[PDB]
Scaffold this active site. Structure first.
Site, PDB file in Angstrom:
ATOM      1  N   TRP B 102       0.837  -1.204   0.000  1.00 37.94           N
ATOM      2  CA  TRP B 102       0.000   0.000   0.000  1.00 37.94           C
ATOM      3  C   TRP B 102       0.869   1.250   0.000  1.00 37.94           C
ATOM      4  O   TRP B 102       0.515   2.257  -0.632  1.00 37.94           O
ATOM      5  CB  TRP B 102      -0.999  -0.014   1.162  1.00 37.94           C
ATOM      6  CG  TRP B 102      -2.050  -1.074   0.940  1.00 37.94           C
ATOM      7  CD1 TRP B 102      -2.286  -2.192   1.679  1.00 37.94           C
ATOM      8  CD2 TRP B 102      -3.014  -1.093  -0.120  1.00 37.94           C
ATOM      9  NE1 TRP B 102      -3.328  -2.914   1.161  1.00 37.94           N
ATOM     10  CE2 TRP B 102      -3.800  -2.249   0.045  1.00 37.94           C
ATOM     11  CE3 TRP B 102      -3.293  -0.231  -1.190  1.00 37.94           C
ATOM     12  CZ2 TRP B 102      -4.848  -2.585  -0.819  1.00 37.94           C
ATOM     13  CZ3 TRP B 102      -4.329  -0.570  -2.040  1.00 37.94           C
ATOM     14  CH2 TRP B 102      -5.100  -1.725  -1.870  1.00 37.94           C
ATOM     15  N   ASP B 172      -1.534   6.872   5.997  1.00 27.45           N
ATOM     16  CA  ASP B 172      -2.591   5.949   5.601  1.00 27.45           C
ATOM     17  C   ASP B 172      -2.843   5.007   6.777  1.00 27.45           C
ATOM     18  O   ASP B 172      -2.054   4.064   6.977  1.00 27.45           O
ATOM     19  CB  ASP B 172      -2.175   5.180   4.353  1.00 27.45           C
ATOM     20  CG  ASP B 172      -3.167   4.129   3.906  1.00 27.45           C
ATOM     21  OD1 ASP B 172      -4.217   3.965   4.576  1.00 27.45           O
ATOM     22  OD2 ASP B 172      -2.878   3.468   2.877  1.00 27.45           O
ATOM     23  N   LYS B 196     -12.108  -1.331   7.001  1.00 17.46           N
ATOM     24  CA  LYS B 196     -11.339  -2.397   7.686  1.00 17.46           C
ATOM     25  C   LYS B 196     -11.642  -2.403   9.161  1.00 17.46           C
ATOM     26  O   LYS B 196     -11.893  -3.402   9.827  1.00 17.46           O
ATOM     27  CB  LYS B 196      -9.845  -2.226   7.380  1.00 17.46           C
ATOM     28  CG  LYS B 196      -9.600  -1.798   5.946  1.00 17.46           C
ATOM     29  CD  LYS B 196      -8.287  -2.343   5.415  1.00 17.46           C
ATOM     30  CE  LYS B 196      -8.468  -2.905   4.021  1.00 17.46           C
ATOM     31  NZ  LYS B 196      -7.574  -2.268   3.019  1.00 17.46           N
TER      32      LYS B 196
HETATM   33  C1  LIG Z   1      -7.244  -1.758   1.636  1.00 19.60           C
HETATM   34  C2  LIG Z   1      -6.186  -0.636   1.796  1.00 19.60           C
HETATM   35  C3  LIG Z   1      -6.242   0.449   0.959  1.00 19.60           C
HETATM   36  C4  LIG Z   1      -7.260   0.538  -0.197  1.00 19.60           C
HETATM   37  O1  LIG Z   1      -8.495   1.112   0.199  1.00 19.60           O
HETATM   38  P1  LIG Z   1      -9.709   1.281  -0.852  1.00 19.60           P
HETATM   39  O2  LIG Z   1     -10.798   1.820  -0.026  1.00 19.60           O
HETATM   40  O3  LIG Z   1      -9.898  -0.089  -1.345  1.00 19.60           O
HETATM   41  O4  LIG Z   1      -9.139   2.236  -1.828  1.00 19.60           O
HETATM   42  C5  LIG Z   1      -5.349   1.469   1.133  1.00 19.60           C
HETATM   43  N1  LIG Z   1      -4.463   1.431   2.183  1.00 19.60           N
HETATM   44  C6  LIG Z   1      -4.439   0.374   3.049  1.00 19.60           C
HETATM   45  C7  LIG Z   1      -3.417   0.316   4.189  1.00 19.60           C
HETATM   46  C8  LIG Z   1      -5.325  -0.655   2.875  1.00 19.60           C
HETATM   47  O5  LIG Z   1      -5.272  -1.687   3.775  1.00 19.60           O
HETATM   48 CL   LIG Z   2       1.023  -3.524   2.748  1.00 16.73          CL
HETATM   49 CL   LIG Z   3      -5.194  -5.533   1.771  1.00 19.63          CL
END
Ligand SMILES: *Cc1c(COP(=O)(O)O)cnc(C)c1O
Ligand SMILES: [Cl-]
Ligand SMILES: [Cl-]
Ligand SMILES: *Cc1c(COP(=O)(O)O)cnc(C)c1O
Ligand SMILES: [Cl-]
Ligand SMILES: [Cl-]
Ligand SMILES: [Mg+2]
Ligand SMILES: [Mg+2]
Ligand SMILES: [Mg+2]
Ligand SMILES: [Mg+2]
Lengths: 356, 360
Positions: B102, B172, B196
């Site tokens: 990511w 993030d 998540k």
């Molecule tokens: C899943 C994930 C993303 C992607 O998020 P979307 O809502 O699918 O764009 C970005 N950063 C991290 C750390 C993630 O786990």
């Molecule tokens: Cl990752």
């Molecule tokens: Cl993921």
């Protein structure tokens, strides 16, 4: 406990779709998980995702050379995504202005490139759709953009222009799948789901595949989503599930022709009420351009307008206040608004006129 | 019915009471006789939900008054480009710390828009750890320094956050936001897709230092300016109302259990059950992460070869376990143990792991 939902966006949904959602909210398809708790890469989700696309394909009879995308960001993001992808240097984003949403789309294009107004009824405060013979088109148009239903003004295209020099592009947010469509007339159609198709959170984009890219952010390329079947990143899974559910309801009632019959009856009830009112209620749209989705009208003065809307609200009607930009009243009668609600509105309108 | 254990990585398990609450009022929210999905986002019923979700977040993470909470569409993935679109100006550098896949996706989008740099990276050793903050190569013309707090695919996690004063620190936090207490003023901006650890897919939480970004950026599309959403309190265009509602409901549940500090306690205990199983397995199970970097949210591991990996995962699926397959880009296994995953699911997984090992 009488409530009549004339909300203009987000809006009424079909009771069977909401009841189906309620029933399986904790245990979707015997998985013992909510549809909301599934991985978007699971087969369980993937079938829902595809079923929503399939139902749209069937109901609008979308040809094989079109792809159906589910994106986030609303129709508003499409206002910029479209020129971002198609408004290449030396081409022109050409707009037909039939209301304020038309204006908002054209504004985003002006950021990114050359624009043009093919026609506009703004001078006459958008009381009608312009005659297609009046369009000013350009050899180098990248697209011609229209708004099929002008949500704030209450006007709607009766039919669509035959455009061959460039793709015809339509913001159908407030009338998509309210009637049959000839999808082949368009290079692209887009709509936030939240008026006729489902809850807020998903945007449906129907795009001629071969129609649509150096330097555009990955998420803002249509190609990304076409290539990944709108599963490039995490889609709005519950919104697409509810969209599926609404589409099953439309299929169950007989499809696009059947829903058009219901819609025409709903609009007939309100417009007849207005027309038979001897000037007590006055519609904004010219007759020939009257929307079947948003009926706009006013009383003879602002204080009656206000008294009407106050009485409406006390009687359980929701959403009838006109858009702030234009005032008056707006009855949004999207697909899921039942005929019984419009009948109730009529009866309220008639009683108010009698009692004034 | 039979047991189901939900280790999905995103979207993921929700706390039952948030779902039960949504189900009960799905057709008639707040006595309006309408679903929250059928309301105007300008209605007082919706505005209440929208404001409450913000207030719960503020209280739970203790966000300062000079920060605003945005609810945006488009996922974390859209933030990968929105961030450099707003802050990566000419003559400046988007500086990234790479600690997983990511992080690379974020970096890639900034490369489209401007000068980028890599401050530090564990990519060479396959992202098994978080680099030492002493190794951070910083630049005077950095527009920001960007990190990934929890590296969802590799199973590693920041234990603490760097002190950065030359540029805004950006994170993030998609897969560990509100899994523990946070000092929000260490950052200029934090973003997280909600699916998540905070609720449903369809909304992205962005916590932003107002003065860093409440100003118009010339040439940026209206929807892609933070300023737009700050000014309109995330009501510029139609919000994802049901997603925000569910987010509210999930935040209410986190508050009901004692907040971030209490949920961290729960999360450490669940994680301990799995890592001790790995660690007592004499190498039958091998965690990807180095011990000092082990994530509390995503436990990544392999068996000794691909055949055993496949047999383990097939047995799990047969026993009711959902989502244990590793990310497709890396294989192996991944137990996602976000806030709402119950501890008895973790005990169940341990049981599976021990009998598989003993019987192999
Ligand atoms: C899943 C994930 C993303 C992607 O998020 P979307 O809502 O699918 O764009 C970005 N950063 C991290 C750390 C993630 O786990
Ligand atoms: Cl990752
Ligand atoms: Cl993921
Ligand atoms: C409501 C509407 C929009 C705005 O959609 P969002 O999803 O709020 O961006 C755009 N165009 C038309 C015709 C609309 O009615
Ligand atoms: Cl309009
Ligand atoms: Cl509108
Ligand atoms: Mg059916
Ligand atoms: Mg008649
Ligand atoms: Mg509480
Ligand atoms: Mg239990």
């Amino acid at each position: 406990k009488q409530v009549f939902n004339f909300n203009a966006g987000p809006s009424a949904l079909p009771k069977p779709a909401l009841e189906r959602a309620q029933k399986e909210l904790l245990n979707f398809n015997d998985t013992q998980m909510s549809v909301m708790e599934l991985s978007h890469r699971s087969q369980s989700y993937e079938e829902v995702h595809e079923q929503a696309q399939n139902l749209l394909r069937e109901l609008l009879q979308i040809p094989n050379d079109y792809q159906i995308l589910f994106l986030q960001g609303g129709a508003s993001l499409q206002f910029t995504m479209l020129p971002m992808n198609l408004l290449t240097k030396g081409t022109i984003g050409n707009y037909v202005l039939t209301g304020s949403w038309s204006e908002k789309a054209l504004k985003e294009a002006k950021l990114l490139g050359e624009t043009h107004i093919a026609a506009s009824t703004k001078a006459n405060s958008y009381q009608s759709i312009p005659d297609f013979s009046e369009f000013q088109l350009n050899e180098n148009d990248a697209y011609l953009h229209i708004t099929s239903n002008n949500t704030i003004y209450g006007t709607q295209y009766q039919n669509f222009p035959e455009i061959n020099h460039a793709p015809l592009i339509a913001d159908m947010s407030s009338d998509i799948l309210s009637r049959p469509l000839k999808v082949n007339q368009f290079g692209m159609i887009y709509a936030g789901a939240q008026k006729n198709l489902g809850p807020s959170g998903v945007t449906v984009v129907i795009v001629k595949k071969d129609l649509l890219v150096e330097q555009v952010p990955t998420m803002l390329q249509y190609a990304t989503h076409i290539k990944s079947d709108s599963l490039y990143n995490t889609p709005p899974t519950f919104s697409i599930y509810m969209l599926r559910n609404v589409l099953d309801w439309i299929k169950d009632l007989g499809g696009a022709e059947a829903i058009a019959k219901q819609n025409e009856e709903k609009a007939k009830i309100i417009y007849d009420t207005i027309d038979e009112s001897n000037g007590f209620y006055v519609g904004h749209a010219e007759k020939g351009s009257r929307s079947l989705m948003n009926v706009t009208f006013n009383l003879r003065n602002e204080e009656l307008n206000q008294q009407f809307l106050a009485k409406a609200k006390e009687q359980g009607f929701v959403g009838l206040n006109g858009h702030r930009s234009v005032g008056g009243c707006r009855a949004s009668i999207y697909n899921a608004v039942p005929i019984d609600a419009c009948i109730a509105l009529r009866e309220l309108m008639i009683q108010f006129k009698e009692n004034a």
